[PDB]
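Cross-posted from the bioinformatics board.
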Amino acid sequence: MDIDPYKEFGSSYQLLNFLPLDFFPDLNALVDTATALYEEELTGREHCSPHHTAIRQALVCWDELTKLIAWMSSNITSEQVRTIIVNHVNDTWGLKVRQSLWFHLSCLTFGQHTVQEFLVSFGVWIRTPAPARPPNAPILSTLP
Amino acid sequence: MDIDPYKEFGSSYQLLNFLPLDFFPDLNALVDTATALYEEELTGREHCSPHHTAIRQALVCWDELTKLIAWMSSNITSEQVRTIIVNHVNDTWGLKVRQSLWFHLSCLTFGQHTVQEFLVSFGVWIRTPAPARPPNAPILS
């Protein structure tokens, strides 16, 4: 199936992918934010919100990934080849986990609607030709 | 952070890990079932249920894994070290994806309380010693 994990959240993948890669905080910061703001809720017994569910699924996935690269690291793969695997991972999969954590943590903190409206505004802006294009990007708050 | 993706669903990794590995259907089978029974809901605009959110997340995760295996397969890795890797993620990561798909698809078609009670009954079963232990496992109905 063709599944966009942002579609049930009123956004889309291509909208997340318009933003510059440096826009999203690094992963460690996002986990620190998630821990500090929602640790009890995410490790709790209740759904809380589909955003919480997305966060836990994404962190669980990322955990499987780090255990995989740890396994092939200590078990099979040499040093340099390990570092190119890890660098490809962080340049791809890690970006996607950061996009997810940023999206859902931002929805929980500032409201899903204002995040949706930000992403849509940014899409409009990046899609506008330079003659008609306003100088300044749409903006949205940043997380702790 | 220490997260059990089943605790939000009133269950437990530990209960899933009691079941034998061959109990969960092949992943192609679970994906076929999710496609046939839930394609339009899963690929839609609405959450539908936490089970749907979990299934889309699980399959998106598995997709990222297949693309990683593809990349390091054709770029980095010899055929035999590749198959060792594919064996590892199949017996580990893949088993876990099958566990997630089976759990949530089972909740959707058969009820969440039904699946919960099944897992707790199976836990009780696998836990009781052979003298007092009934001969036939709990079923899911």
